Amino acid sequence: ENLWVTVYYGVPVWKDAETTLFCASDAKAYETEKHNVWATHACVPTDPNPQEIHLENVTEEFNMWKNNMVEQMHTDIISLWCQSLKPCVKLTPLCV
Amino acid sequence: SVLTQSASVSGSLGQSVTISCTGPNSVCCSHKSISWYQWPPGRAPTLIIYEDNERAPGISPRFSGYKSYWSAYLTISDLRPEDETTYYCCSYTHNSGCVFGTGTKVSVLGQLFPPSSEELQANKATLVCLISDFYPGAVTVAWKAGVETTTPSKQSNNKYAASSYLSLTPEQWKSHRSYSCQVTTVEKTVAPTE
Amino acid sequence: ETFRPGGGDMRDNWRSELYKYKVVKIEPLGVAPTRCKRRV
Amino acid sequence: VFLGFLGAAGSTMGAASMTLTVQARNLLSGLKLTVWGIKQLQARVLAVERYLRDQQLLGIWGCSGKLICCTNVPWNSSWSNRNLSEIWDNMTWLQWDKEISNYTQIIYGLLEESQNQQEKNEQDLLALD
Amino acid sequence: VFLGFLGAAGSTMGAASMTLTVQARNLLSGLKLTVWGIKQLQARVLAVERYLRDQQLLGIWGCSGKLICCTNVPWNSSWSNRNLSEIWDNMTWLQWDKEISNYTQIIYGLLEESQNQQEKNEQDLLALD
Amino acid sequence: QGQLVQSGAELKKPGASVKISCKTSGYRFNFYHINWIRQTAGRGPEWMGWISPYSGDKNLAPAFQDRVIMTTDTEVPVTSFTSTGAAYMEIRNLKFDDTGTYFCAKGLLRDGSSTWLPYLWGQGTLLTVSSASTKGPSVFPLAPGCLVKDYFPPVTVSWNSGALTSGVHTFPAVLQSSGLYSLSSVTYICNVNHKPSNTKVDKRV
Amino acid sequence: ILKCKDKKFNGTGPCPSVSTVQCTHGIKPVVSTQLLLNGSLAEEEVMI
Numbered sequence: 001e002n003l004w005v006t007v008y009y010g011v012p013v014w015k016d017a018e019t020t021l022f023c024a025s026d027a028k029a030y031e032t033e034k035h036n037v038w039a040t041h042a043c044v045p046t047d048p049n050p051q052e053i054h055l056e057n058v059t060e061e062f063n064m065w066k067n068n069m070v071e072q073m074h075t076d077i078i079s080l081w082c083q084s085l086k087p088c089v090k091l092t093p094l095c096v
Numbered sequence: 097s098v099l100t101q102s103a104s105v106s107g108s109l110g111q112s113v114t115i116s117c118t119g120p121n122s123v124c125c126s127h128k129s130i131s132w133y134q135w136p137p138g139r140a141p142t143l144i145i146y147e148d149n150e151r152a153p154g155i156s157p158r159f160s161g162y163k164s165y166w167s168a169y170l171t172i173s174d175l176r177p178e179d180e181t182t183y184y185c186c187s188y189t190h191n192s193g194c195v196f197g198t199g200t201k202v203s204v205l206g207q208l209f210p211p212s213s214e215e216l217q218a219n220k221a222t223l224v225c226l227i228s229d230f231y232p233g234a235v236t237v238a239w240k241a242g243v244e245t246t247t248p249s250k251q252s253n254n255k256y257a258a259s260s261y262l263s264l265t266p267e268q269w270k271s272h273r274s275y276s277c278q279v280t281t282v283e284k285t286v287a288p289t290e
Numbered sequence: 291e292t293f294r295p296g297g298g299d300m301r302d303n304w305r306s307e308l309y310k311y312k313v314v315k316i317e318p319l320g321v322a323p324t325r326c327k328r329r330v
Numbered sequence: 331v332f333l334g335f336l337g338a339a340g341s342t343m344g345a346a347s348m349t350l351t352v353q354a355r356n357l358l359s360g361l362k363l364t365v366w367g368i369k370q371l372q373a374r375v376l377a378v379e380r381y382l383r384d385q386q387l388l389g390i391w392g393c394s395g396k397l398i399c400c401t402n403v404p405w406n407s408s409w410s411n412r413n414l415s416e417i418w419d420n421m422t423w424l425q426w427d428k429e430i431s432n433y434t435q436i437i438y439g440l441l442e443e444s445q446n447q448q449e450k451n452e453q454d455l456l457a458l459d
Numbered sequence: 460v461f462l463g464f465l466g467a468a469g470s471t472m473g474a475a476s477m478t479l480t481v482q483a484r485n486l487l488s489g490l491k492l493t494v495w496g497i498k499q500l501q502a503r504v505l506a507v508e509r510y511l512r513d514q515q516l517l518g519i520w521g522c523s524g525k526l527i528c529c530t531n532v533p534w535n536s537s538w539s540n541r542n543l544s545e546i547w548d549n550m551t552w553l554q555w556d557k558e559i560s561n562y563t564q565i566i567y568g569l570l571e572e573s574q575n576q577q578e579k580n581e582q583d584l585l586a587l588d
Numbered sequence: 589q590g591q592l593v594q595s596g597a598e599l600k601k602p603g604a605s606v607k608i609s610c611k612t613s614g615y616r617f618n619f620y621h622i623n624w625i626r627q628t629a630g631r632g633p634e635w636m637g638w639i640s641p642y643s644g645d646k647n648l649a650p651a652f653q654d655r656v657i658m659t660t661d662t663e664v665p666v667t668s669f670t671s672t673g674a675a676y677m678e679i680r681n682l683k684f685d686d687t688g689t690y691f692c693a694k695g696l697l698r699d700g701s702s703t704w705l706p707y708l709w710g711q712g713t714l715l716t717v718s719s720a721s722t723k724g725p726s727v728f729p730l731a732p733g734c735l736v737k738d739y740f741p742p743v744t745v746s747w748n749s750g751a752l753t754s755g756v757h758t759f760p761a762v763l764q765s766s767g768l769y770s771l772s773s774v775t776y777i778c779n780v781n782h783k784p785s786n787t788k789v790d791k792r793v
Numbered sequence: 794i795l796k797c798k799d800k801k802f803n804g805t806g807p808c809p810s811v812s813t814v815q816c817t818h819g820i821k822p823v824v825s826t827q828l829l830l831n832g833s834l835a836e837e838e839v840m841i
């Protein structure tokens with residue numbers, strides 16, 4: 001009846017956090033390019049059979065308005081918009 | 097009921113008391129689990145022991161249970177004033193339900209209003225002889241020159257109370273000199289002249 | 291009350307699809323009690 | 331059955347103690363000059379840091395078995411005051427960590443001590459023979 | 460006590476043999492387009508390389524326990540010619556490594572051999588039953 | 589850990605049906621069973637059945653197999669680990685042997701052999717099966733509390749809207765030879781509510 | 794990445810039916826201002 005601690009490795013324990021997410025697009029997105037795709041240059045091919053596990057008895061609290069994957073997406077899109085026009089022809093000797 | 101307990105059992109304060117819980121082989125106690133409940137009349141019951149072994153959450157260690165092959169027992173050590181109540185047992189399993197018992201009363205040993213003026217305009221007259229704060233719960237009420245008397249009920253302070261009423265007519269209000277409520281021995285007497 | 295189109299901030303354009311998702315880190319270390327001791 | 335990754339996240343600790351080899355499986359791993367390369371790389375190293383952070387603790391503790399384990403540290407009642415059949419059949423791992431989050435670091439100190447102490451003690455038994 | 464990280468760096472090998480779980484604890488882990496990101500990243504990977512370099516040797520040797528360990532390799536006198544109570548009570552780890560730096564690689568060869576040899580030998584005992 | 593609250597006491601004539609509700613608060617409604625147990629003053633305490641909200645698993649007794657129907661709503665969460673819900677139980681072939689008190693009860697655990705075992709209970713609803721009709725209470729001030737003389741559906745008694753709670757002694761009623769109950773209790777404002785009659789009366793003493 | 798599987802969900806609060814996934818569905822980065830285009834339709838009743 002005297003209890004002892006016992007270590008467990010692999011417990012469904014998570015906490016809300018923010019990391020660097022990456023992209024993923026089909027193999028066809030990498031196909032349709034004459035340097036024409038504005039992003040897919042270095043995107044990971046998506047898993048052919050995505051898997052969605054339903055977590056029964058689980059009730060998690062969401063908050064769309066203070067979610068960070070949005071900030072990552074937008075600032076990344078901004079940076080991609082930027083970077084796609086650096087090596088392109090500059091019209092400085094215009095404005096005549 | 098098919099599950100039979102001890103009709104009554106007693107014990108003195110600071111002592112122990114065992115309550116039995118027996119029945120046929122189909123209900124007790126081979127391949128069966130036993131649970132106990134503290135059930136105050138008029139209030140919600142409380143789980144004490146579950147799985148004929150293990151005390152409910154928040155229960156003091158003063159209780160203990162034990163199941164044999166034919167019957168189960170609940171030993172309550174160090175009796176308290178608030179333990180004088182009814183204790184039921186149930187026999188159950190994982191699939192089937194509960195079969196309650198007959199009940200065991202545990203005994204811990206070693207321890208007038210006049211009719212209003214609005215009622216006289218109805219008109220009727222009923223005098224109210226209320227009883228409170230007595231132990232043990234066994235009293236007798238007599239009337240002296242519509243008789244009703246309740247049974248002794250345990251209060252929220254571990255004491256007993258009751259109440260007896262007598263209905264009288266308005267003609268007898270100015271025709272009788274006085275009336276008495278005897279309670280065994282105290283006695284209260286009213287003179288109905290306003 | 292009258293309602294008029296708005297915008298300006300385009301993060302909304304993404305909140306319209308990232309309203310049903312959220313990120314979580316995994317911390318798989320959990321200790322629990324049980325009447326078990328490893329011998330010496 | 332195989333409920334999959336994090337299948338038993340809403341289940342009792344006793345029912346989720348069966349699926350510890352699944353959450354451990356998918357815990358490590360299931361390009362020109364760009365910005366996604368680093369986007370994936372810094373995440374691909376954080377994966378390793380988050381894995382070995384756990385593994386070094388699991389190693390400096392008495393149990394490199396990496397599944398389940400018992401320890402010679404008495405469960406200090408002051409931590410929970412709850413019952414064996416009232417947590418393993420009536421509480422979820424998340425809820426449980428929610429209770430014990432306060433004392434987690436303390437427990438880690440005690441495990442590291444007990445383990446270093448056991449190993450130092452076993453060398454003395456091995457040296458006399 | 461807890462003298463902290465590298466507390467017993469000037470202490471005798473016997474007194475520093477008590478603080479092996481502390482130096483192992485702080486041995487692994489206690490941002491826009493820039494030059495510091497890589498500055499930290501290449502260091503954050505060198506940490507891992509320097510850790511696993513040790514761990515693979517500790518694994519291919521007989522002892523993945525990661526604290527202290529004994530081995531079935533006779534201490535070849537030619538290496539030191541010093542005494543048990545004259546190193547564990549009269550010499551510091553740094554000084555000791557300063558003596559044995561010459562033969563360290565040799566010893567590693569012998570440990571790898573002894574361990575592979577033991578494991579091959581134990582499979583034959585397990586196969587007859 | 590939770591809090592079980594039930595609907596009110598009703599007078600329903602035999603034969604007719606009745607539906608008792610049991611609203612919850614303070615825990616995952618779907619994580620534990622809901623048991624229904626009655627107590628009538630002649631047979632004794634009696635279990636009738638239980639239900640599992642998450643799944644929809646029932647198990648009535650052979651006696652109530654043929655005239656009872658349990659129903660369960662859905663769970664509205666409040667936090668990640670608590671919610672609110674409600675459970676109903678409908679009786680149909682009302683007999684005189686169906687008068688007394690009726691309690692809903694919370695399960696104990698989630699797995700094992702004692703998962704449905706009633707642990708936490710409600711306040712219990714008083715059901716009265718009689719062909720006699722409802723009569724409201726005739727409250728009277730007591731010459732130096734209040735006096736409930738004639739009623740018949742169970743009486744509540746507060747003070748100054750529930751302010752003067754200390755020193756209050758309410759006593760049980762008495763069963764007259766007419767079937768009526770009568771109890772007594774002792775800015776003075778005793779609030780006597782009588783929901784079966786749908787009458788709330790506040791009296792000054 | 795946890796994905797709420799509730800048909801009527803205003804984005805804030807507990808989600809009764811949650812599932813998990815590794816990568817979200819195909820989210821096209823459409824740049825508009827007043828009207829959202831080629832987006833994900835709601836389920837049953839329109840969503841606010």
Ligand SMILES: *[C@@H]1O[C@H](CO)[C@@H](O[C@@H]2O[C@H](CO)[C@@H](O[C@@H]3O[C@H](CO[C@H]4O[C@H](CO[C@H]5O[C@H](CO)[C@@H](O)[C@H](O)[C@@H]5O)[C@@H](O)[C@H](O[C@H]5O[C@H](CO)[C@@H](O)[C@H](O)[C@@H]5O)[C@@H]4O)[C@@H](O)[C@H](O[C@H]4O[C@H](CO)[C@@H](O)[C@H](O)[C@@H]4O)[C@@H]3O)[C@H](O)[C@H]2NC(C)=O)[C@H](O)[C@H]1NC(C)=O
Pocket residue numbers: 056057190191192338340341342618619620621640642643645646647697698699700701702703
């Ligand atoms: C999600 O969350 C919830 C909450 O945490 C959690 O739910 C719990 O899960 C456990 C495990 O499944 C449940 O506990 C079990 O309950 C069993 C009781 O049901 C049995 O008996 C029922 C009635 O039997 C009577 O009537 C039938 C005919 O009606 C008759 O044959 C019988 O003789 C008897 O008269 C019956 O309804 C029920 O049927 C269900 O299950 C069968 C298969 O098992 C299925 O075919 C049916 O369709 C129906 O789904 C079942 O037959 C109980 O028996 C069981 O006991 C086992 O364990 C003990 C050890 O303790 C063993 O000794 C014993 O032999 C049994 O093996 C166990 O107690 C619990 O009630 C759930 N609900 C809660 C906690 O609220 C979920 O699991 C979570 N899920 C996930 C994925 O996370």
Ligand SMILES: *[C@@H]1O[C@H](CO)[C@@H](O[C@@H]2O[C@H](CO)[C@@H](O[C@@H]3O[C@H](CO)[C@@H](O)[C@H](O)[C@@H]3O)[C@H](O)[C@H]2NC(C)=O)[C@H](O)[C@H]1NC(C)=O
Pocket residue numbers: 428429430432
């Ligand atoms: C982990 O430890 C912390 C203390 O280090 C615990 O925090 C304490 O929690 C209690 C509630 O259990 C707080 O009491 C609160 O008081 C306010 C004041 O009115 C009241 O409004 C709240 O309703 C609550 O009763 C207490 O203040 C708080 N301690 C501090 C310093 O803030 C925490 O509960 C522990 N975690 C767990 C899971 O037990």
Ligand SMILES: *[C@@H]1O[C@H](CO)[C@@H](O[C@@H]2O[C@H](CO)[C@@H](O[C@@H]3O[C@H](CO)[C@@H](O)[C@H](O)[C@@H]3O)[C@H](O)[C@H]2NC(C)=O)[C@H](O)[C@H]1NC(C)=O
Pocket residue numbers: 557558559561
């Ligand atoms: C590790 O092994 C090396 C040999 O591979 C050892 O180096 C040798 O050390 C001795 C001193 O102990 C050197 O002798 C020196 O001779 C010069 C010549 O006059 C003299 O001036 C010095 O005072 C010293 O006596 C020897 O030359 C040197 N070997 C070589 C090839 O240079 C080394 O000592 C070993 N390490 C330890 C900790 O023992």
Ligand SMILES: *[C@@H]1O[C@H](CO)[C@@H](O[C@@H]2O[C@H](CO)[C@@H](O[C@@H]3O[C@H](CO)[C@@H](O)[C@H](O)[C@@H]3O)[C@H](O)[C@H]2NC(C)=O)[C@H](O)[C@H]1NC(C)=O
Pocket residue numbers: 831832
């Ligand atoms: C404009 O909106 C319409 C919506 O009806 C788009 O056509 C519909 O596209 C959706 C997917 O975007 C189709 O739903 C999918 O159908 C598969 C069929 O197996 C199902 O398994 C998936 O779960 C998913 O629900 C839907 O069938 C399709 N409607 C028809 C009549 O074919 C259309 O593509 C949109 N145009 C754009 C965005 O330019």
Ligand SMILES: *[C@@H]1O[C@H](CO)[C@@H](O)[C@H](O)[C@H]1NC(C)=O
Pocket residue numbers: 149150151153154155157411412413414
């Ligand atoms: C846990 O339950 C056991 C039943 O064996 C009981 O003896 C003990 O007092 C309980 N512990 C607590 C903290 O309630």
Ligand SMILES: *[C@@H]1O[C@H](CO)[C@@H](O)[C@H](O)[C@H]1NC(C)=O
Pocket residue numbers: 406407408436
């Ligand atoms: C563990 O419980 C004991 C009870 O004897 C208490 O004195 C002690 O402070 C607790 N230890 C810690 C580290 O919390």
Ligand SMILES: *[C@@H]1O[C@H](CO)[C@@H](O)[C@H](O)[C@H]1NC(C)=O
Pocket residue numbers: 535536537565
């Ligand atoms: C170990 O000492 C022996 C003495 O018998 C010597 O012959 C041998 O060379 C030494 N081994 C090595 C590898 O230095």
